Design a protein around this ligand. Structure first.
Ligand code: CL
Lengths: 64, 64
């Protein structure tokens, strides 16, 4: 007794749910990229600061 | 007046902070993977269900 209209309803409901899942995946990716970007900026700042501390060591070794 | 001991302290502190950043990145990656995995399970369940609904359509089309 389940007819083509019933099956159509189910297909449309599932595709609606898929649209929500796609939107959720985009938001999750944006959040992840945001966190990774902050981490990368901080790691790069640590790297540059380490290069200048290595140059301070170098200057003191040259004074030796 | 800032001696090699001061520079050493600063380098060790920056590398300590870097270790914390690394563990934070690992946690961010685990969290991301957990969310992506749940999304993937849900999307695959939708896909299998849509295949099942396409077969229900197919059976009704065969019924003609
Ligand atoms: Cl790393």
């Amino acid at each position: 007794e389940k007819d083509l209209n019933d099956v159509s309803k189910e297909i449309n409901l599932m595709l609606s749910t898929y649209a929500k899942l796609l939107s959720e995946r985009a938001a999750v990716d944006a959040s992840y990229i945001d966190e990774i970007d902050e981490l990368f900026k901080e790691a790069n700042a640590i790297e540059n600061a380490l290069i200048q501390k290595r140059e301070e060591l170098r200057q003191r070794f040259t004074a030796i």
